[PDB]
Amino acid sequence: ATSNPAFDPKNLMQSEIYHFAQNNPLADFSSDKNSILTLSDKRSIMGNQSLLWKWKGGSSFTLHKKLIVPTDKEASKAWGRSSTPVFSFWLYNEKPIDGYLTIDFGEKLISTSQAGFKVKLDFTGWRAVGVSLNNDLELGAKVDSIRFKAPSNVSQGEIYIDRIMFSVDDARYQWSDYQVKTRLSEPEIQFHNVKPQLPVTPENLAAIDLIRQRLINEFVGKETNLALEENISKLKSDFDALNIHTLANGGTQGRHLITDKQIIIYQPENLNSQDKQLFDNYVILGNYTTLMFNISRAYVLEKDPTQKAQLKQMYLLMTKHLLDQGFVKGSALVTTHHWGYSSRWWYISTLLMSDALKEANLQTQVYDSLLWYSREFKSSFDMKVSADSSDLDYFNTLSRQHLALLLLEPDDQKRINLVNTFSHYITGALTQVPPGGKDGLRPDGTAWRHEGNYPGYSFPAFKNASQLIYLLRDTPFSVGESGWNNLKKAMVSAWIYSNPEVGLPLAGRHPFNSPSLKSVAQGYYWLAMSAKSSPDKTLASIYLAISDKTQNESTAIFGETITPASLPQGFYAFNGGAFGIHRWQDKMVTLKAYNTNVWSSEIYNKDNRYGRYQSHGVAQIVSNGSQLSQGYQQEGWDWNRMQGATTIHLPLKDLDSPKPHTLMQRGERGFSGTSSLEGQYGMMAFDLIYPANLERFDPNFTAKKSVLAADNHLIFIGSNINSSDKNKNVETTLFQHAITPTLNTLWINGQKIENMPYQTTLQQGDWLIDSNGNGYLITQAEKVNVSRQHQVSAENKNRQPTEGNFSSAWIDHSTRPKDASYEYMVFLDATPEKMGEMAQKFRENNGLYQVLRKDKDVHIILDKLSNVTGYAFYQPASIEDKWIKKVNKPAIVMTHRQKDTLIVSAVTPDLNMTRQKAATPVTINVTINGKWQSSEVKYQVSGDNTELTFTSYFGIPQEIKLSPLP
Numbered sequence: 024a025t026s027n028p029a030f031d032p033k034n035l036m037q038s039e040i041y042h043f044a045q046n047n048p049l050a051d052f053s054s055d056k057n058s059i060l061t062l063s064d065k066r067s068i069m070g071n072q073s074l075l076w077k078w079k080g081g082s083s084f085t086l087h088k089k090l091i092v093p094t095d096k097e098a099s100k101a102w103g104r105s106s107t108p109v110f111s112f113w114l115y116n117e118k119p120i121d122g123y124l125t126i127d128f129g130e131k132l133i134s135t136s137q138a139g140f141k142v143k144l145d146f147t148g149w150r151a152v153g154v155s156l157n158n159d160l161e162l163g164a165k166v167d168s169i170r171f172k173a174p175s176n177v178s179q180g181e182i183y184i185d186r187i188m189f190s191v192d193d194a195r196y197q198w199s200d201y202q203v204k205t206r207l208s209e210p211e212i213q214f215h216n217v218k219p220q221l222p223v224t225p226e227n228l229a230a231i232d233l234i235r236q237r238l239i240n241e242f243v244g245k246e247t248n249l250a251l252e253e254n255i256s257k258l259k260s261d262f263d264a265l266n267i268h269t270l271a272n273g274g275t276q277g278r279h280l281i282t283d284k285q286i287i288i289y290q291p292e293n294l295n296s297q298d299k300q301l302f303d304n305y306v307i308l309g310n311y312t313t314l315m316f317n318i319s320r321a322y323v324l325e326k327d328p329t330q331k332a333q334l335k336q337m338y339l340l341m342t343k344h345l346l347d348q349g350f351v352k353g354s355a356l357v358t359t360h361h362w363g364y365s366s367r368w369w370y371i372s373t374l375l376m377s378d379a380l381k382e383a384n385l386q387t388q389v390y391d392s393l394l395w396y397s398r399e400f401k402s403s404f405d406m407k408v409s410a411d412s413s414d415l416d417y418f419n420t421l422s423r424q425h426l427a428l429l430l431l432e433p434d435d436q437k438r439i440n441l442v443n444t445f446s447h448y449i450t451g452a453l454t455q456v457p458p459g460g461k462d463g464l465r466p467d468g469t470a471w472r473h474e475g476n477y478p479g480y481s482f483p484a485f486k487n488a489s490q491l492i493y494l495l496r497d498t499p500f501s502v503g504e505s506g507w508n509n510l511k512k513a514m515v516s517a518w519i520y521s522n523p524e525v526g527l528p529l530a531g532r533h534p535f536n537s538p539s540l541k542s543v544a545q546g547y548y549w550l551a552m553s554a555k556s557s558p559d560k561t562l563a564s565i566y567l568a569i570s571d572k573t574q575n576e577s578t579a580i581f582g583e584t585i586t587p588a589s590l591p592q593g594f595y596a597f598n599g600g601a602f603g604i605h606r607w608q609d610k611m612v613t614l615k616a617y618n619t620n621v622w623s624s625e626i627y628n629k630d631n632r633y634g635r636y637q638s639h640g641v642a643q644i645v646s647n648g649s650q651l652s653q654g655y656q657q658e659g660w661d662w663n664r665m666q667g668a669t670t671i672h673l674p675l676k677d678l679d680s681p682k683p684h685t686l687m688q689r690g691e692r693g694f695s696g697t698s699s700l701e702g703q704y705g706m707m708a709f710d711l712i713y714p715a716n717l718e719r720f721d722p723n724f725t726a727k728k729s730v731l732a733a734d735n736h737l738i739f740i741g742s743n744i745n746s747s748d749k750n751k752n753v754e755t756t757l758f759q760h761a762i763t764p765t766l767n768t769l770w771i772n773g774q775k776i777e778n779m780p781y782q783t784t785l786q787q788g789d790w791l792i793d794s795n796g797n798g799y800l801i802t803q804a805e806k807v808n809v810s811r812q813h814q815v816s817a818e819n820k821n822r823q824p825t826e827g828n829f830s831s832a833w834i835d836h837s838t839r840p841k842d843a844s845y846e847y848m849v850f851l852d853a854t855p856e857k858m859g860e861m862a863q864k865f866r867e868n869n870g871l872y873q874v875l876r877k878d879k880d881v882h883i884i885l886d887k888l889s890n891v892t893g894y895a896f897y898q899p900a901s902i903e904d905k906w907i908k909k910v911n912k913p914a915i916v917m918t919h920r921q922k923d924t925l926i927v928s929a930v931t932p933d934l935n936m937t938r939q940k941a942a943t944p945v946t947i948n949v950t951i952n953g954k955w956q957s958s959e960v961k962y963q964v965s966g967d968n969t970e971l972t973f974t975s976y977f978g979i980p981q982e983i984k985l986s987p988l989p
């Protein structure tokens with residue numbers, strides 16, 4: 024504390040704190056005859072002493088401090104967000120008081136003399152009080168008096184006060200509690216309860232105790248963001264450093280506990296050097312509760328009985344210090360927002376210490392406290408299934424904590440009702456199709472957070488949701504088969520679209536830091552072993568592949584011999600992210616588009632700044648293994664040249680998102696994505712349309728981009744490519760990868776190229792092989808550039824410069840000022856000898872494929888290697904074709920004529936929804952030439968032709984096998 028006024032307009036953000044760690048510490052305080060002020064070193068919040076106030080009822084003391092109270096607007100301007108000036112302090116009662124402490128603000132006040140507030144004194148332990156001086160008093164600039172009046176209707180009494188503070192605080196975070204009413208309240212949990220109730224029986228109680236034990240087992244024998252410490256020397260050393268001691272008639276003294284978010288009320292950047300030094304002595308709750316958990320785990324594993332007892336005493340003392348510090352029911356502590364980050368491992372520690380807390384008579388206090396602070400999560404913790412219940416962050420950061428809270432309930436019947444209700448909650452959250460863009464699983468196996476398919480959030484949710492189902496398995500509390508089935512679909516999908524990292528197009532805002540299925544591995548074991556007919560051989564076979572375990576290892580793990588899954592082969596459509604996956608041998612190709620319902624990219628203030636082209640009709644090829652080891656290197660990466668994309672090559676200042684904070688650019692129409700045929704063949708249809716008026720986006724940049732994928736190959740075609748500037752800098756990237764000693768060779772037309780730097784220009788009938796063994800045959804292009812070159816780029820978080828050496832090739836569309844086009848073919852198993860053979864078949868009147876149509880209405884690709892035809896109806900149309908005559912909606916149709924049958928698939932990749940509305944099915948009428956008889960696809964012969972009726976739900980393809988009528 025200084026001689027300056029509070030909120031000194033001179034230095035508004037500098038908190039004025041009465042902590043008494045300074046010379047003449049009571050200088051600014053006066054008392055009436057019926058009050059006595061002493062320092063005590065018995066307990067304190069900041070510095071080693073607190074104000075002991077002995078009083079008779081109605082007696083006052085006065086703090087004399089000039090307050091220049093800012094408006095909410097002036098506070099907000101000073102800090103840069105919605106702010107209010109706050110008055111706060113800590114008080115300790117050694118015994119409860121039945122009445123109210125009155126705090127009054129005014130000028131030159133005395134016992135007998137503007138505005139003020141009340142604090143109920145019915146409690147023991149530390150409590151914090153924090154009120155907005157502008158919004159929470161029942162204030163003219165001349166305030167110099169803060170009068171603390173003991174309650175009238177109570178004969179005498181005593182109170183410890185510390186850390187009386189004037190600060191600028193976040194306007195969201197002065198919360199009401201059992202001591203103070205503010206303008207803000209986080210209402211208490213009100214648990215839902217499902218009927219019928221399960222009875223208290225030995226069988227149901229035993230199942231509850233086995234669920235608790237199974238949780239203990241998971242935490243005592245590696246969690247992300249759990250700073251595990253197993254060295255007991257280290258736990259004892261950290262614990263002693265808390266300087267906790269039990270006091271005579273109750274409570275503790277030890278270092279003050281504060282959450283990472285509670286520190287805001289101090290404005291610590293702006294603290295005077297004296298206050299900062301004391302503040303720096305606080306303990307961050309996150310660290311403290313992590314320590315409680317590590318001690319609990321060590322306790323559970325400890326074989327030495329002396330050490331074991333010591334670890335229990337350490338845990339219970341930490342528990343007593345935490346409760347006495349005011350982390351108790353009815354104590355807001357001004358705020359506890361983002362409570363999970365500070366407390367998640369406290370919840371889990373209570374499972375391990377449940378019997379110790381029972382014996383110490385602390386279980387009801389710890390349960391009431393955790394329940395109270397959990398009210399921040401009321402939307403999930405109440406356990407009433409809603410459109411928001413499928414929250415993927417919940418499944419990651421809160422679901423096991425939620426279970427642990429319920430198991431901590433002291434009454435047996437209520438504990439069984441809560442865990443029964445939880446099982447129903449989790450089942451519904453894992454079963455329902457949330458409307459619109461809300462979080463959760465989807466029927467194609469995509470899994471959404473931030474209103475789209477998001478592996479970076481779904482992968483940790485899959486791990487923990489699988490664990491939850493496994494914890495409850497084979498009990499009266501087991502998750503419904505419908506939730507198991509949905510989660511299996513999403514997790515088998517993740518195995519398909521990862522190799523073992525998700526591709527660049529699925530990286531969300533973390534390009535070059537893709538999530539890996541390796542982090543989810545244990546979830547496959549958990550979900551396999553929780554099957555109704557356990558083990559689920561598909562999920563077990565994936566667990567062994569991903570975890571690098573052999574068939575010989577399977578018997579001990581699963582109780583029967585299972586062969587590790589081979590990599591999935593064929594084509595899989597995922598219109599939930601307007602993508603598809605083509606798999607052949609050890610390669611995965613991620614084909615990705617975007618549309619009204621699928622954002623192109625997530626770009627934040629410091630994430631994915633150059634990610635504009637993440638979903639521009641990309642076709643990233645990934646062999647099984649590290650993507651970095653295959654040359655997907657962020658340093659020097661040209662963000663313009665995403666593999667398969669058609670882009671405008673821009674300087675990075677122009678490619679950067681035009682929004683300083685968040686942009687999630689959605690497309691201009693519902694239709695773009697993929698479809699599949701026989702689980703083997705795929706097609707992408709991408710209508711590249713830019714916004715009419717977004718800064719840095721050329722409103723006239725357009726392209727129609729189709730890909731047909733079958734076996735070892737993909738046919739890429741593009742048409743109707745345009746820009747505002749005659750296709751200047753408009754380019755289609757064949758590939759880009761870093762040059763390393765392992766990635767040193769390109770082939771061009773049978774010649775080995777290793778020089779750096781190197782440039783050449785190729786054209787129709789030329790071919791290349793990149794260092795990852797992908798071959799590219801140029802089948803239509805005037806100008807293909809190939810470059811081995813030093814590149815300068817910038818990293819996606821802070822735009823700081825990077826550099827690296829890269830091999831790349833791209834089509835230059837500037838040679839066709841209007842409606843530029845391309846065709847090329849990729850071989851996934853290319854060798855110079857096989858590419859010589861494919862080039863020869865291309866020169867033989869194109870024995871590889873034929874484009875039957877390539878315009879703004881339809882792209883039709885006949886693959887002559889596979890004998891499959893792909894039809895990208897960008898618009899409804901009548902066509903001239905052997906098989907297809909007409910389609911009445913934008914759609915993707917595919918055909919395969921085999922021996923005695925014609926197989927037809929159809930879909931729209933349009934999800935037919937908004938951010939708000941549920942997807943509904945689209946009816947697609949596909950007329951085919953000839954008379955056919957036979958899948959849920961309906962057909963009707965109609966003259967010399969056959970009407971097929973497809974139902975496209977969430978872009979999930981349907982197919983039918985037809986055979987000719989005579």
Ligand SMILES: CC(=O)N[C@@H]1[C@@H](O[C@@H]2OC(C(=O)O)=C[C@H](O)[C@H]2O)[C@@H](OS(=O)(=O)O)[C@@H](COS(=O)(=O)O)O[C@H]1O
Pocket residue numbers: 416462472473474627685
């Ligand atoms: C603040 C911001 O830039 N984005 C908001 C999200 O926050 C980020 O995402 C998450 C997360 O999803 O866990 C945590 C961090 O705050 C940020 O990286 C997020 O807000 S959240 O309440 O913090 O989670 C979302 C809201 O959820 S959502 O649309 O799935 O409903 O809003 C983002 O904009």
Ligand SMILES: CC(=O)N[C@@H]1[C@@H](O[C@@H]2OC(C(=O)O)=C[C@H](O)[C@H]2O)[C@@H](OS(=O)(=O)O)[C@@H](COS(=O)(=O)O)O[C@H]1O
Pocket residue numbers: 247248419420479480483531533536537538
């Ligand atoms: C999409 C996203 O940001 N997800 C969050 C995680 O970050 C990804 O994973 C990790 C990582 O934790 O190694 C690092 C990068 O930030 C992302 O690639 C991660 O956020 S965190 O900022 O890394 O802590 C997790 C945190 O989960 S936790 O709450 O289990 O610790 O939240 C993600 O899902």
Ligand SMILES: [Mg+2]
Pocket residue numbers: 041042043044067068069070071072073185186
């Ligand atoms: Mg003090």
